[PDB]
Amino acid sequence: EKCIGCSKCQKSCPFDAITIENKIAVIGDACTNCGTCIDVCPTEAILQEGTEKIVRDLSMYKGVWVFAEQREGKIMPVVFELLGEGKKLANEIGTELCAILCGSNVAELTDELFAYGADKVYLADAPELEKYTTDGYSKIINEAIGLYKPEIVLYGATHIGRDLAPCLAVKVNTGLTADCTKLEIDPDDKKIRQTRPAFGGNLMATIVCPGSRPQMSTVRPGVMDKAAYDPSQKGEVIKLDATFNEGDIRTKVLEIVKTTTDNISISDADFIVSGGMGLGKPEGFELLKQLADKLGGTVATSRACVDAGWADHAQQVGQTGTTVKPQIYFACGISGAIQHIAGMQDSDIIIAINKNENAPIFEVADYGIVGDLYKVIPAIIEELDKIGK
Amino acid sequence: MYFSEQNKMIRKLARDFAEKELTTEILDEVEESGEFPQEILDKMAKFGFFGIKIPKSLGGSGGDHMSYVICMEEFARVSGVASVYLSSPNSLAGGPLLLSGTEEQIEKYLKPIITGKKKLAFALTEPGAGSDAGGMSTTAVDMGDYYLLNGRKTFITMAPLCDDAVIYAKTDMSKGTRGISAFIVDLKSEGVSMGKNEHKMGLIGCATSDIIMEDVKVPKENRLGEVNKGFSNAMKTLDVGRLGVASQSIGVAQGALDEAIKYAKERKQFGKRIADFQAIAFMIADMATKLEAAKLLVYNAASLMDNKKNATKEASMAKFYASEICNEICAKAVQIHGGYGYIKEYKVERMYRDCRVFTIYEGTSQVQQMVISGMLLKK
Amino acid sequence: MRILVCAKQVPDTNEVKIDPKTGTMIREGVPSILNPDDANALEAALVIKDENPGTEVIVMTMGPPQASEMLRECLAMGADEAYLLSDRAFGGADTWATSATLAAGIKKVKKVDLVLAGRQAIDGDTAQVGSQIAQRLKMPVVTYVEDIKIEDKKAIVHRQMEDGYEVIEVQLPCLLTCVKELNDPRYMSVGGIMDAYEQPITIWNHEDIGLSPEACGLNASPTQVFRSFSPPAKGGGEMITGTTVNEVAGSLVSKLKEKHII
Numbered sequence A: 001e002k003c004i005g006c007s008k009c010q011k012s013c014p015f016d017a018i019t020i021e022n023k024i025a026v027i028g029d030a031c032t033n034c035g036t037c038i039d040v041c042p043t044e045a046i047l048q049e050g051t052e053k054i055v056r057d058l059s060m061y062k063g064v065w066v067f068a069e070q071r072e073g074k075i076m077p078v079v080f081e082l083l084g085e086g087k088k089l090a091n092e093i094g095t096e097l098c099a100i101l102c103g104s105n106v107a108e109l110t111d112e113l114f115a116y117g118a119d120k121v122y123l124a125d126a127p128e129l130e131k132y133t134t135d136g137y138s139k140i141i142n143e144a145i146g147l148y149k150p151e152i153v154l155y156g157a158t159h160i161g162r163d164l165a166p167c168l169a170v171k172v173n174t175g176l177t178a179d180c181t182k183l184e185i186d187p188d189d190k191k192i193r194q195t196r197p198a199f200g201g202n203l204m205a206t207i208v209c210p211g212s213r214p215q216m217s218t219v220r221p222g223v224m225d226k227a228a229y230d231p232s233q234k235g236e237v238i239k240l241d242a243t244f245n246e247g248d249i250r251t252k253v254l255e256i257v258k259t260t261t262d263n264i265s266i267s268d269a270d271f272i273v274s275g276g277m278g279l280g281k282p283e284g285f286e287l288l289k290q291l292a293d294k295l296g297g298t299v300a301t302s303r304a305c306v307d308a309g310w311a312d313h314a315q316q317v318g319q320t321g322t323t324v325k326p327q328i329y330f331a332c333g334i335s336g337a338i339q340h341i342a343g344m345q346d347s348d349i350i351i352a353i354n355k356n357e358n359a360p361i362f363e364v365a366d367y368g369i370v371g372d373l374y375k376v377i378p379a380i381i382e383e384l385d386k387i388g389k
Numbered sequence B: 001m002y003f004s005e006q007n008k009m010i011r012k013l014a015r016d017f018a019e020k021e022l023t024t025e026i027l028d029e030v031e032e033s034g035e036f037p038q039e040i041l042d043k044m045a046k047f048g049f050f051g052i053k054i055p056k057s058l059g060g061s062g063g064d065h066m067s068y069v070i071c072m073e074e075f076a077r078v079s080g081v082a083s084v085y086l087s088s089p090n091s092l093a094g095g096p097l098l099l100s101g102t103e104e105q106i107e108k109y110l111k112p113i114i115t116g117k118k119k120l121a122f123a124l125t126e127p128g129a130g131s132d133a134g135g136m137s138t139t140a141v142d143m144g145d146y147y148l149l150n151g152r153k154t155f156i157t158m159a160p161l162c163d164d165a166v167i168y169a170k171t172d173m174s175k176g177t178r179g180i181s182a183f184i185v186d187l188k189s190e191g192v193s194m195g196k197n198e199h200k201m202g203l204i205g206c207a208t209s210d211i212i213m214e215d216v217k218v219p220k221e222n223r224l225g226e227v228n229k230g231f232s233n234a235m236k237t238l239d240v241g242r243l244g245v246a247s248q249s250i251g252v253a254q255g256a257l258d259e260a261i262k263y264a265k266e267r268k269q270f271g272k273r274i275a276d277f278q279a280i281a282f283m284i285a286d287m288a289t290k291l292e293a294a295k296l297l298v299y300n301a302a303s304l305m306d307n308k309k310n311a312t313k314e315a316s317m318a319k320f321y322a323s324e325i326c327n328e329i330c331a332k333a334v335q336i337h338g339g340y341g342y343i344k345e346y347k348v349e350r351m352y353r354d355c356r357v358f359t360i361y362e363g364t365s366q367v368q369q370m371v372i373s374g375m376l377l378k379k
Numbered sequence C: 001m002r003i004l005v006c007a008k009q010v011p012d013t014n015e016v017k018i019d020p021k022t023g024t025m026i027r028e029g030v031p032s033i034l035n036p037d038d039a040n041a042l043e044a045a046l047v048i049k050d051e052n053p054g055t056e057v058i059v060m061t062m063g064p065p066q067a068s069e070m071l072r073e074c075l076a077m078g079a080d081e082a083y084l085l086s087d088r089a090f091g092g093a094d095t096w097a098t099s100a101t102l103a104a105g106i107k108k109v110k111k112v113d114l115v116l117a118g119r120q121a122i123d124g125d126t127a128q129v130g131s132q133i134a135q136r137l138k139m140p141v142v143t144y145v146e147d148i149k150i151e152d153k154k155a156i157v158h159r160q161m162e163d164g165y166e167v168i169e170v171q172l173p174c175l176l177t178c179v180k181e182l183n184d185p186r187y188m189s190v191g192g193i194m195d196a197y198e199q200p201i202t203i204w205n206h207e208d209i210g211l212s213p214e215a216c217g218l219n220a221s222p223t224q225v226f227r228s229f230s231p232p233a234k235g236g237g238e239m240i241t242g243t244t245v246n247e248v249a250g251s252l253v254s255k256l257k258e259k260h261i262i
């Protein structure tokens, strides 16, 4: 009774509050019988409870929600994938596929995101959301939780979502997974089987959140694919408030920069196009330079070219050269001496392009193609952009 | 032996460092241009590798001998010349200062070389005096306000890069081994002149020449300890130095072996890989067991030094056995590499050349055997 | 000033790549290193110490007593005070519990002006714990830090974006997770190690930090790992065929997309 209202015991509670439904220690739906507030009150206030947890349900509402990255008010292609197999996600358990969008004066993307497959779409046209901010959408999406509480909340593994997601999870006291690979729904227990690679990609794990509503997960860009666009089904554009405060967003942006990173080390790269004496002329690297550019990696060389004068030693790979462990390697016109194969054996996948089929490189080639690279290489770039990288 | 948990950390440090800062690109440039990059030396002193066994009482690092051997090994593995630039202030320059030096001399001389501002050469060998350092011919005369010296020193490591050099001259020409004093000489002084840099087989990056002394006057205030003690000074420095040379023997050894099993795993000839032919695998074994056997030899020597028992025999064994089986190892590693181990691009050839002095300098293997047998046969 | 850095000891994921063709790759004795991005964060704080004198750095962690040694490394680099969190209940917890006990372990020290962490740790690959500690403590959070420079009372920073970066101003106190692109962490010193092993480490428990005895670690864990399996190898190095020069490319690129990041 004599709670003296000391206010010292506010933040040690694990959900930070329960305080101000007009008052501190006016608690309710989040006491987890933790035992932090046992003695921290000067006069031993509330003292008999604690072996009870919160498992009180009605915890099953719907909601399959896709966030829309809106770079400069434009849907980022990542959302077309997240709407691709996320609509699949919504269908198996049975629920609408809701979407949230937060921008400044976004008007046409409403119809775009409606057309690409989403049933329902939420919108926040407040010029205060012109740029990206972790508290703005934090508070703005946290606002959409108490009112339209969903069950599934998806995100993009892009640098925007991978910052929004953990911050949003801690306040709602739910569970989250990292950049995920593929998902499903266990048909009888309604929950989501989240799968992702961890341990640098050496141990896959299906992490699940049983006592957590909603279920959220940043999903990797490129794993799913696009859905059908422009059925122009409907829309139910719903409103949220965008009720900003007098300094309720401490992150403030000075400048945004867009660089063109052209310097990149053969050791740091994630994709490599290597060329050997199968070029004949030093000018071949332009071709491979074209190849490397659609992928975002560098050109490497073998000794034959260096000792011929077509390249510098910084580029060479093998026992005398430098060792590479990319995510992809292009073995173009290289005999295949162990003096080379030694320094790339652990490339996650090796693709070979040689004229003569009796070249050793096809021993570790994951995929092989026989021919002249000057014809094969350009055709590879053709079908490359034709799907959308 | 058994490693103290701090020494395991130091092992980690010297590993990441020596591996990271001594790149192929650099080491190749050191062989071509016999000049080690001052920037790297500064970088080393900044984390104290120049001050391993000297205690914080004098502004050192407070490590034990095992930490000096650990750093010596892990550096020398990656590059020989690096080790040379490492042992000098730790053992050969900082030894006699640490023993027979007054507090003033240590304030003005030792701390500079621990921080990498000054460089100090240990100069004992003469053209007439090699193994028989007692048969010196450099003279030192007492004039009252200064000492006057007249002689010549061959094979003086780092000397053209050095600012002062501890030089051993004969004071009492009649006493011989009993009549040698040790002096600190500013190499910039009068009379002092340097010979040509010697073209050596390996360990290229560190210059090595003669120190010529022509009526050079040295003040009395720059003499090492007592008069006619110089010889015992140099011996008791030479024990920890020999521990150094065995230390680098074991370093480059473990390295050339690591390159050995690497090439033998990767190369294929008859469909099998090299390492699955019995001759090779057994050869690898043989090299490995000697190397370990004797790692245990030298580790043991250094631990004795750390617990203050005389290590004069144990160190001599360490230098002898370590350097010799190092050469055997280096060669065998060439032979595993086959033809390719004869081209300079394959690191094993630089090792093979480096590891050869190890049985000569710091006292030959013969001088080592003389010390050891002479210690076991006295009756 | 007081700068607290959250460093985690982790298994070296670089070397542990190989496994038997009949084996779930959990090895016998794997080396435990300081998570690289944490090394970057600690370096940032060490440069603030290098520039602003008299600024003491507090490094904290949660895990087993084996993590103690990594803390020593941190101290040999130049850190001031080390703190470890270990308990029978702490182990086997998700990012929510881990962040909760971490921030709670922060709350009981000399109030810090700046808190630093890493983008993510190579063993869980979650990149969540830092931001959850930040917002759980009602602070600003700025991840992907590429260049950090504090202007004597508030922070202006770079945010590494996929195509660039965002210069951002933030009021202290705050938490910002670091990334390896921004600095070259310094080595230890031979003297740093010796002085590091003598400085004592203060170790707390679930009954020491004034926390939940009942609901930490595995007990209060919203996310729980269920399946733990390996990813399959492909093996078949069978070529791509075709009639036409372009016909081959199609099958190459299409197979290259299906079950791939393309």
Ligand SMILES: Cc1cc2nc3c(=O)[nH]c(=O)nc-3n(C[C@H](O)[C@H](O)[C@H](O)COP(=O)(O)OP(=O)(O)OC[C@H]3O[C@@H](n4cnc5c(N)ncnc54)[C@H](O)[C@@H]3O)c2cc1C
Residues within 6 Å of the ligand: A275, A276, A277, A278, A279, A301, A302, A303, A304, A305, A316, A317, A318, A319, A320, A321, A332, A333, A334, A335, A336, A337, A339, A340, A353, A354, A355, A356, A359, A371, A372, A373, A374, B340, B343, B345, B346
């Ligand atoms: C000490 C030493 C160290 C060495 N270290 C290395 C090292 O680290 N790395 C290294 O790579 N090498 C190294 N070498 C050399 C190595 O052994 C080979 O000589 C080298 O790999 C040959 O170059 P290449 O691999 O491109 O094959 P090459 O034989 O030079 O290339 C010819 C191949 O390309 C094919 N080809 C020709 N024209 C075309 C075309 N138009 N389209 C497609 N295919 C075509 C040919 O059919 C053949 O398969 C070293 C050699 C020595 C002596």
Ligand SMILES: Cc1cc2nc3c(=O)[nH]c(=O)nc-3n(C[C@H](O)[C@H](O)[C@H](O)COP(=O)(O)OP(=O)(O)OC[C@H]3O[C@@H](n4cnc5c(N)ncnc54)[C@H](O)[C@@H]3O)c2cc1C
Residues within 6 Å of the ligand: B267, B269, B270, B274, B277, B278, B279, B280, B335, B336, B337, B338, B339, B340, B342
């Ligand atoms: C200066 C020089 C000049 C040369 N001139 C010529 C020349 O004019 N003409 C020419 O044709 N060649 C020449 N060569 C090449 C040289 O003769 C061959 O390289 C030599 O036969 C060794 O070849 P390799 O290094 O490839 O052997 P590798 O097979 O690469 O070496 C394998 C190593 O393991 C051992 N080994 C190999 N197979 C087995 C096995 N089954 N079981 C156990 N151990 C095994 C070998 O002893 C060797 O040490 C020259 C080489 C040099 C260095």
Ligand SMILES: Cc1cc2nc3c(=O)[nH]c(=O)nc-3n(C[C@H](O)[C@H](O)[C@H](O)COP(=O)(O)OP(=O)(O)OC[C@H]3O[C@@H](n4cnc5c(N)ncnc54)[C@H](O)[C@@H]3O)c2cc1C
Residues within 6 Å of the ligand: A175, A176, A177, A178, A198, A199, A203, A204, A205, A207, C006, C007, C008, C009, C035, C037, C038, C060, C061, C062, C063, C093, C094, C095, C096, C098, C102, C116, C117, C118, C119, C120, C121, C122, C123, C124, C125, C126, C127, C128, C129, C130, C223, C225
């Ligand atoms: C295979 C696997 C999958 C997992 N999947 C999930 C999942 O989907 N969801 C989930 O919630 N949990 C998951 N976990 C558990 C989660 O990893 C633990 O909470 C773990 O202790 C934290 O690792 P992390 O990957 O989240 O760290 P990260 O979030 O990657 O680390 C970010 C930063 O947190 C700081 N940090 C974290 N822990 C400590 C600490 N103890 N001491 C100091 N600094 C620290 C570091 O500075 C680091 O830079 C998984 C664990 C495993 C092994």
Ligand code: SF4
Residues within 6 Å of the ligand: A003, A004, A005, A006, A007, A008, A009, A024, A025, A040, A041, A042, A045
């Ligand atoms: S702790 Fe006891 S006193 Fe302090 S607020 Fe909560 S109830 Fe009121």
Ligand code: SF4
Residues within 6 Å of the ligand: A012, A013, A014, A015, A018, A027, A030, A031, A032, A033, A034, A035, A036, A037
């Ligand atoms: S125990 Fe229940 S009430 Fe006391 S803090 Fe933890 S949650 Fe809030």
